[PDB]
Amino acid sequence: DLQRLKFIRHARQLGFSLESIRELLSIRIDPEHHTCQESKGIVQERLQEVEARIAELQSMQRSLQRLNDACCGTAHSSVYCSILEALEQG
Amino acid sequence: DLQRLKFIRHARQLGFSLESIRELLSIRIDPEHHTCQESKGIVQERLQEVEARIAELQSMQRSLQRLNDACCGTAHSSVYCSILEALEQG
Ligand SMILES: [Zn+2]
Numbered sequence: 001d002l003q004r005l006k007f008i009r010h011a012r013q014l015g016f017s018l019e020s021i022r023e024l025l026s027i028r029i030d031p032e033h034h035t036c037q038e039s040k041g042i043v044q045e046r047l048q049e050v051e052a053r054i055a056e057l058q059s060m061q062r063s064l065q066r067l068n069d070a071c072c073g074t075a076h077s078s079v080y081c082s083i084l085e086a087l088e089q090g
Numbered sequence: 091d092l093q094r095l096k097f098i099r100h101a102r103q104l105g106f107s108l109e110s111i112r113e114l115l116s117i118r119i120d121p122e123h124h125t126c127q128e129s130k131g132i133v134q135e136r137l138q139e140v141e142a143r144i145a146e147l148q149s150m151q152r153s154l155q156r157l158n159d160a161c162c163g164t165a166h167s168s169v170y171c172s173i174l175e176a177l178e179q180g
Pocket residue numbers: 071072073074076077080081126
């Protein structure tokens with residue numbers, strides 16, 4: 001029951017890079033020589049990384065939604081498929 | 091100017107796996123023997139993959155937002171930092 005393992009798992013579940021986690025463990029073991037500025041910087045970095053991803057994934061999701069909704073999804077010959085036509089224009 | 095290269099790039103920008111792209115190129119080269127059901131299935135699979143990711147990334151973003159907002163981010167000794175306390179409870 002080494003408590004820092006739970007700490008690490010939680011940082012992991014938040015998608016912190018191994019390098020960021022090393023920094024956090026460094027702060028955790030010696031708090032008297034680190035500040036809120038350092039720990040917050042690590043969080044802001046990870047937060048910006050996540051928000052940028054979510055944005056580029058939602059862009060894809062919107063395009064994928066249009067592609068999905070326009071196709072009939074039946075035995076209709078793919079010779080007429082809008083999905084292939086769309087991927088052609090991009 | 092081999093047009094299928096543009097096709098591939100567009101599928102790439104949508105985050106389709108290499109295997110899905112192989113399937114699309116197979117449909118593209120021989121449309122007379124494939125249907126909208128096949129091409130749509132490939133799109134739905136990718137769409138569900140993206141929506142699940144966006145959901146797990148937004149979960150992180152919400153937690154990261156709370157962590158970020160609660161910390162003063164100044165020289166305040168990390169001995170009092172809420173970020174480390176939070177990562178402790180998870
Ligand atoms: Zn159709």
